[PDB]
Amino acid sequence: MRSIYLCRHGESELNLRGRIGGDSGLSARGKQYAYALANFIRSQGISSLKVWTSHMKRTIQTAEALGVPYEQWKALNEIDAGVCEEMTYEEIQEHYPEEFALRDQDKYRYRYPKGESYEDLVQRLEPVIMELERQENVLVICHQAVMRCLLAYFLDKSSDELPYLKCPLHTVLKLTPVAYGCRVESIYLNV
Amino acid sequence: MRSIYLCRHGESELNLRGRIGGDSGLSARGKQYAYALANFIRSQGISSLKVWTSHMKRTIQTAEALGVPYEQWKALNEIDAGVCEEMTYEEIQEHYPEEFALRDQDKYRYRYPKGESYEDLVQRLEPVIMELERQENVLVICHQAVMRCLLAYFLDKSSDELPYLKCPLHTVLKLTPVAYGCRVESIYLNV
Numbered sequence: 001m002r003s004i005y006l007c008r009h010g011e012s013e014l015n016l017r018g019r020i021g022g023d024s025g026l027s028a029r030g031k032q033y034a035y036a037l038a039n040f041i042r043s044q045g046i047s048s049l050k051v052w053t054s055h056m057k058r059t060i061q062t063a064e065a066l067g068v069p070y071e072q073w074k075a076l077n078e079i080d081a082g083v084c085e086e087m088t089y090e091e092i093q094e095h096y097p098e099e100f101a102l103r104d105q106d107k108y109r110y111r112y113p114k115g116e117s118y119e120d121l122v123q124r125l126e127p128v129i130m131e132l133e134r135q136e137n138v139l140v141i142c143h144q145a146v147m148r149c150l151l152a153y154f155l156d157k158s159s160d161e162l163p164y165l166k167c168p169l170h171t172v173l174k175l176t177p178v179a180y181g182c183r184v185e186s187i188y189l190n191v
Numbered sequence: 192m193r194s195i196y197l198c199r200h201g202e203s204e205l206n207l208r209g210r211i212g213g214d215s216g217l218s219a220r221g222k223q224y225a226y227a228l229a230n231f232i233r234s235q236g237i238s239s240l241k242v243w244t245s246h247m248k249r250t251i252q253t254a255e256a257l258g259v260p261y262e263q264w265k266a267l268n269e270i271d272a273g274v275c276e277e278m279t280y281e282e283i284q285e286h287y288p289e290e291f292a293l294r295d296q297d298k299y300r301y302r303y304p305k306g307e308s309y310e311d312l313v314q315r316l317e318p319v320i321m322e323l324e325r326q327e328n329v330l331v332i333c334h335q336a337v338m339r340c341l342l343a344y345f346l347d348k349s350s351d352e353l354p355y356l357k358c359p360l361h362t363v364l365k366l367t368p369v370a371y372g373c374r375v376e377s378i379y380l381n382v
């Protein structure tokens with residue numbers, strides 16, 4: 001059957017600097033992953049694959065290694081942390097202790113000033129999920145928050161579980177949707 | 192009336208890099224806080240203030256700027272992240288994915304591989320709290336997880352609330368234990 005492969009962009013510069021969001025490029029080992037992903041996809045022996053990315057440099061650069069064309073979806077853009085974009089957690093805690101604490105009580109519906117919530121991201125992904133449900137083999141090179149929302153849908157996860165879903169870097173999740181439910185397979189690309 | 196001044200060390204190098212634990216020294220503006228603290232303390236005109244720090248460079252260095260003598264307590268050292276020491280949250284999610292997920296399940300009792308938990312921390316702080324109770328004016332320059340436990344005791348917090356207490360950097364928490372409970376005053380030192 002067809003499979004949807006979800007994975008985050010290769011490790012970014014900001015990832016490396018403990019900062020969130022932004023629009024940075026891939027780190028040295030971040031590019032190593034892109035290539036390792038290319039080989040993984042190759043080893044799968046797929047005849048036709050649709051590769052989707054976001055408008056972020058980090059997803060695009062990852063796709064560049066695949067050597068194949070890819071489509072850029074804005075809805076696959078990472079969650080907007082608002083004023084807290086490009087900050088570390090400590091930096092957020094110090095200058096926005098009120099907001100940070102408010103997020104922990106309802107991480108699904110909380111929005112940082114000028115930012116999106118997890119709930120917002122979900123609604124924004126509806127068209128992507130819809131298209132995904134009517135396609136064959138698709139690879140979605142996205143982001144942690146985005147990946148969590150898609151992953152929550154295919155695995156019937158509650159909004160409460162969603163924001164805490166396991167979504168590490170350099171790890172490909174092979175989803176195989178069936179009659180009901182979806183098979184999952186985690187493949188870590190050590191680089 | 193006696194007051195307990197709880198605060199963290201000045202921003203450390205690892206704090207600046209978003210990595211946990213370790214034993215790094217204060218950053219540039221970390222020192223500015225130490226100085227800003229020295230000013231705030233003098234301005235408080237405290238009578239025979241006792242100063243406690245941990246055995247970590249970051250707490251000691253902050254106390255140095257005070258001029259007045261301080262006392263080091265091993266029992267005030269930050270929570271041991273175990274094998275996850277000095278890693279960033281991403282590194283933790285990628286290399287110890289299951290462990291990271293198991294954390295949020297029960298953050299009070301969860302320990303990283305070969306690491307401490309909030310409960311272990313509470314335990315080694317018992318003596319610290321006893322001494323803190325049989326004193327008058329004390330200034331404790333410690334760490335985040337440590338500060339949460341002391342703060343948890345004085346504000347009569349539950350073990351579930353504890354791990355999520357607001358303990359930002361560069362912020363003095365003046366606790367004035369009274370009859371009805373404990374009065375709180377937060378003084379952020381912007382540097």
Ligand SMILES: O=C[C@@H](O)COP(=O)(O)O
Pocket residue numbers: 020021079144145163
């Ligand atoms: O950019 C980080 C987003 O994934 C928000 O989720 P988080 O709780 O892991 O920080």
Ligand SMILES: O=C[C@@H](O)COP(=O)(O)O
Pocket residue numbers: 211212269270335336337354
């Ligand atoms: O070193 C960080 C400790 O405070 C652990 O608690 P945390 O959930 O705020 O990271």
